[PDB]
Symmetry: D2
């Protein structure tokens, strides 16, 4: 078995294969640099209820994704214990907090933040999850700017955070202990003939043979499998959801006891603080879908992240020391849903397109793919997210066009801007036309979700035309 | 016996109506001109504020918990009082009542130390009095279309807390006064005449003299200045200053209006944002407050901008494109010790009804019946005895409480703008404000401390005006100790 | 008859009335209009005697605009004698018409570079070309001003002999001077002009009466076209005049002081601008907003009052913040649909028009008065004003392309003038998304006529019915003239 | 021993090392310091060759300040030959030290009038007095810049022959030139200077070793005083040097472009400032914040990064918003407690100091190098450097009154530079309430010494213990010298 990729998904599937099949040799590719790596840039939140939006819980596909995340939450306590057990006290703790506080402030669009706070509260009640709406005065540690302060707060029990760096170290250590082999090179090419995997050509010229290849190369995953015959239009494209976060040494070495977060905001960005050991905090995180990868933060992203954290969470962060600006690529699937499971090629498996919550879902997704590889059926509701599929259409064109305009306006309210009071209504009405025109021009059947549509809108004419050709070719293959 | 009421505000006319109806024996004359120079009443929306007027700082003093209780009592008189005033007119005179209910909104365009504390205090006071009310989803508040960055995140529906049209109320009081046999004489009192400790009557500003055995002073912010001319009384009747207030009448873009009063809790130095409905495609928006040591009859640019910016962002962006019909200015009678001047004097037949600051209009029917009862040999309403006009200045708060209050409220003028500052600046201004206000309080008197609303005015007044107040405070101490 | 009726009691009506009465003592001159001056531009004006201050790059780029500038310089030379001739009919207690001799133009960054930077250069250039006396001065040397440092000027321009009048005292002096020269004030409004066999008979008034005349001069500001359009054929031969609604304010200064000069910026988004005109007695005038409306409006909007007060308190003097508001003023600048005045004779004998002066009718009043009087007496008046004859095809002084660039720039300028605070990529996004809807509107309205920017923004945000009515108007005008 | 040890591998250490090695081929010159350059000012610098750009009205109002300005003009004349002499020891592929020949100073309103307006005038005046070539230019003529119109400049000043170096390539060229002239690099730190009978013996290093020498030049940036103060009596005879912590950034421009000149403002609140220094290969340098800290700090604060990035994206180029951040840099400007450098000889024979250069050590390096070398060789070096001898009483270059005006103005300037938005009466209120607490602090610290504004603000917001320690220091210095 060859696992291509050394993120949380690659290492999590590698650990589960190695522990479950002591008979077989499991090799994991990827370099310690983790170029464009989502995982090292993550806080990370074990986000289930925190990730709830009204827009997600309005599609069937979205209610399924939410159910899996609740399931994944139940595996974390044992999974952590099983990974910490292969190390000692000095390797540090994977778990960084047990609980999450969701804050509602007015530094954002009512049509996102108000709707999403209600949707979160509703989803917690429906799943009988333990939680409490609390007085903002009772939230410890936070010292916001009064003009940016929260007026409602929501304590969620058993929704916490891990140190993504210590998790990666624990997965690697646990992989070696169970007999896995780390080979620090990149796959250039997957070899297949007569509908079967032969193995993987590596970037130092070598060839490794295998009967099983699991692709978990984050945002590079589809580009790798698409080179095989016919698969270019049968595996949905994955783009880079570029994300900026930061490590900060607090002025007084303090930190909050819980995760602090807002609901998801414009184009699936969001404001959160994840606690860390040793007088550090994690703050994140921006999101921008890019058609080409990018390994460095923009000035705009750094300023936005720091302005939100200092005003909405703690003014003390203003006088605190910046240790590190982190950048990673959320694997952003073109149809807004993960690529998990088997292929029309025997022994070829895919584990990618997890966007915001691959890390959270890692233990569930790992056990699902391992079960499928062993002749089982894995977890029930994952069937729809099979990697070899027609692009999913989870929303009407009309729903997406309302969403893209709302989210575009939300980039204004989140700044927050100060405008003449008639300007917002004028921009609302003048945004509808150009986005309606773009959607009609791209395809008669497929509509990109908002996050991707805004990226396409501000891309070059050549990049747009290439997407028209892609969408048309996918329609030819499937309809 | 002749009665003269000096002043044609809600208090003067309300006491006039109650005297005329209750004492057909006596001839009652009411002074004051249709211009109503500095008049608080014509500038008022006005809200029938009881629970809406609740602040943590008010409900932390004994004197404040009493004032709150009276306001609940006054609310119960309004339905019959309105019916009794509307009955003397016809359909074409219009309705006094403009709304039955109030929605209190909480947004972040203000200080947490005022707006958060005051929202909790209101919710607590409604539960304690078992008053009908409901915390409601903001999405369910009709009509409002705020700027999302200025929007409310909590709303509170209060049943039976409403509003009157102050202009139609004044017209109904005048009409009801004439009907019950009162006489309107449209001149101003210049001087009250007394000898051998008894009122003889009133010299008017056209040179005339009207005799009377009873004179009720309800001249709003001019009330103390009028009585202080009599011997010894300069330091025995607490001073009343002008709480200058700006409001506006707006013709809405589409002729619509909210069905309820829309308001925030009280804000920096007893200002606040509210919209009171009106008939005929108009709304009232108010209202600023600034205590001034001299009267002022015109709005400042700053006040108009602040009022319009708050209403357009926090209540309805449609007000931005709406037509300004009228900018209104009136003087809230602001008593130097923060409590009303209601009742009898050391001079026989001399009565005072003033210093009501924010809520004289709301309390008018109760205050009217109280003074009328005292005039007829009764005891009126319990606990209004404490606000007798001839007294030593009251000390309802420690110097320490007021200095915390004045700094908090000063910072609140920043958060209400709202300003945008570097994040360390507010803490720096907080610490550098304490000293100058502590220094001012120590310099003014060893016993008396002005409440916050007045202290900020004194801080930014001239050196001569400050020294004159040191002499006033010292002279009051001499008289009473 | 040989009777003259002037319809309208603004600066133009009263100025033409005074010149007729003084020049024709033989004939009876009657002037209509009420003391309320409903929608009156003149009482709402500061007013600036604007020539060089009114210079924009966009104006000095069209032929029609370079002509307008030349007339304004000419009008400036008449003001000293005109004032003396009006003050002479009164006494000391009637007060002074002139309120300042000089103007300072300020450049700050509370606005669009594409307007304020270009227009400051255009003003400086036009002063040098005309050899007019002026000096670029240190901002530190500008007396009185106390701006917010973040809104302060970094360049200032002193213009000698470009000053201001009190519009109220001017109106009082014109009325008094009209009576003195033998004119009669009849305080009613004209409802209808009577003509038959291509000749004026007179005017039906709003109290039911009929006044006969051989001459009718229409100077009814923004109501002027609506009045003449009722005559046969003239509906599509006299270009429409709309209301350029303007808000200004009288303020009693905190300490009773005022600047010795006019203080102003160059003209800004959609021909608004910030200025302070001195007044006697501890008052200043601040103005002035501009918004073209398809229907008249007699009350300021909240938005206009806030914008005017925010600009004055930040850009001129923070002391205005603590100063007392005496009066909010509203008047209608007569806004001609083709962006040029309506001055002179008609196809109807004895019917004359004096309107569509937009921002500078008051400044040009003495010149315009003498021009119309000269035409009435068989002369040719002033040379370049023949072009602005009221009975004409709509003028096309700019290409559709020039106007579409202008309307987008000016729209963005309403942002920079607020001033807004936005993420840095938002302005470029709004620029590109504004082009399409305005290009679409211009193509839909007519294949030949394009409204100027000030009017196009008003049409863009008007109702569908009002837009369709304008398509019918433009088409009917094309039918009449082509 | 005729051995020379230079302690420190910044621009000053390496510049004095190069000049000693080239001028004394007879003697062994050894230079200490590690390639990490912990807290190193030089690697964090753009850097500007700032003479006229560094001019403030406040500097040119003291005698001590006019002297400092004169030295900077002198240093400018040495740069062309100094660069040629350093580039000559390498080849084309080592890169160019010079990154621009010229500087544009921009004036915008995103700041205090009392600093930016006064400092623009002071710069223009100082250029004329020194007969330096320069021109006030139209802002429209400044290449490359694309500011936010609300943050744009309205005046610009082109300075010829005031340029920039790549601080990294300069360090590489100094090292190369040092080895070429026979110098020896020993990459350890000095822990202690050895002296007995009033003479230097040598230097104990941080790996336990001892290097002997007859000459020790201390150029250890902000660590320089702490090192020499350990010798007897010198604790109160060498003025303290604190860390002027500075944040800058390397940015890869969206399109790989860069300006042809340095772009800068005048110096702003507490000696911060906005500048862009060009670099080769699609990079620009942006800087630079300043905060005097009583303890060293090796990491930027969130506040510093946000302020630097907000100023650059609004005031210079909006394209920087979408550009990639390559590196956030932090270095310690050596901040002398009396606001003047420590350059020259000591009461200890063979002990020399070269530090406390704050903002312009790099610029002055060639002059300061030649001065110390001349003193070491029995000469008098450069004339106006005498006052800045390292062993001295604290200088009092300003009255307490001048500093208290300065600290309040600069404090307010942190507001206007944000830029904040407040109610218009708030600034005057904070001005009057700031005077008291700073007057109280100054009186409490000493009856004779007053810290300059940059240091006073740091002391004001430090702990009570740190303040009391400064009262003891000031009192001990008074005891020693009076
Ligand atoms: C800023 C940020 C914040 C986040 N916050 C959260 C959070 O709060 N909660 C949460 O649950 N999740 C969070 N995530 C992560 C999210 O869940 C992602 O979907 C998840 O990390 C994806 O994991 P992955 O292993 O598929 O990809 P990655 O983490 O990108 O790992 C893929 C690896 O494959 C390597 N690779 C690429 N090409 C090759 C090749 N040819 N050969 C070999 N190796 C190759 C890459 O270098 C990389 O190391 C965050 C991500 C980002 C960027
Ligand atoms: C806010 C503002 C500021 C200005 N500032 C300046 C400035 O600084 N400098 C400058 O040169 N100019 C200024 N102007 C004015 C500009 O020059 C105008 O072009 C000029 O005032 C037009 O004068 P008018 O007499 O044509 O119209 P108006 O002044 O509008 O007078 C027309 C009069 O006719 C009356 N009328 C209407 N219908 C009838 C009828 N049927 N019968 C009789 N009478 C009727 C109206 O009620 C009104 O009183 C300003 C205008 C405004 C609104």
């Amino acid at each position: 078995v060859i696992v291509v990729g050394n993120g949380v998904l690659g290492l999590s599937v590698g650990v589960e294969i190695a522990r479950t099949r002591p008979d077989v040799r499991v090799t994991l590719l990827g370099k310690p640099a983790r170029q464009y790596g989502a995982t090292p840039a993550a806080g990370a939140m074990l986000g289930a209820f925190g990730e709830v939006t009204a827009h997600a819980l309005a599609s069937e596909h979205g209610r399924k994704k939410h159910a899996l995340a609740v399931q994944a939450q139940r595996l974390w306590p044992e999974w952590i214990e099983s990974l910490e057990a292969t190390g000692t006290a000095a390797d540090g703790r994977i778990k960084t907090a047990d609980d999450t506080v969701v804050l509602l402030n007015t530094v954002g669009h009512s049509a996102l933040d108000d709707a999403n706070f209600a949707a979160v509260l509703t989803a917690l009640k429906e799943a009988n999850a333990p939680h409490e709406e609390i007085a903002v005065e009772s939230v410890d540690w936070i010292d916001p700017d009064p003009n940016s302060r929260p007026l409602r707060a929501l304590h969620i029990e058993g929704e916490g955070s891990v140190d993504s760096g210590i998790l990666l170290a624990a997965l690697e250590r646990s992989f070696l202990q169970a007999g896995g082999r780390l080979h620090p090179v990149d796959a250039t090419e997957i070899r297949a003939s007569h509908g079967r995997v032969e193995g993987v050509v590596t970037d130092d010229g070598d060839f490794l043979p295998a009967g099983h290849v699991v692709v978990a190369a984050g945002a590079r995953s589809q580009r790798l499998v698409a080179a095989l015959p016919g698969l270019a239009h049968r595996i949905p494209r994955i783009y880079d959801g570029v994300g900026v976060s930061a490590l900060v040494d607090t002025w007084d070495g303090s930190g909050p006891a819980t995760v602090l977060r807002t609901s998801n905001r414009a184009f699936a960005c969001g404001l959160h603080l994840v606690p860390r050991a040793g007088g550090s905090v994690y703050i994140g995180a921006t999101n921008a879908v890019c058609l080409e990868p990018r390994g460095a933060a923009s000035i705009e992203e750094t300023v936005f992240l720091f302005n939100c954290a200092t005003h909405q969470l703690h003014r003390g962060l203003n006088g605190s020391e910046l240790r590190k600006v982190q950048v990673g690529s959320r694997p952003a699937p073109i149809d807004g849903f993960p690529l998990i499971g088997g292929t029309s090629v025997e022994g070829l498996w895919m584990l990618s397109g997890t966007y915001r919550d691959g890390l959270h879902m890692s233990p569930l997704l790992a056990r699902h793919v391992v079960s499928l590889m062993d002749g089982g059926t894995g977890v029930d509701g994952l069937r729809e997210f099979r990697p070899e599929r027609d692009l999913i259409s989870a929303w009407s064109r009309e729903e997406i066009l309302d969403d893209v305009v709302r989210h575009t306006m939300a980039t204004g309210y989140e700044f927050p801007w100060r405008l003449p009071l008639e300007w917002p209504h004028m921009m609302e009405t003048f945004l509808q036309g150009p986005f309606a025109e773009l959607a009609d021009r791209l395809s008669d059947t497929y509509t990109p979700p908002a996050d991707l549509m805004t990226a396409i809108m501000f891309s070059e004419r050549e990049q747009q035309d290439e997407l028209i050709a892609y969408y048309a070719d996918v329609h030819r293959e499937w309809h």
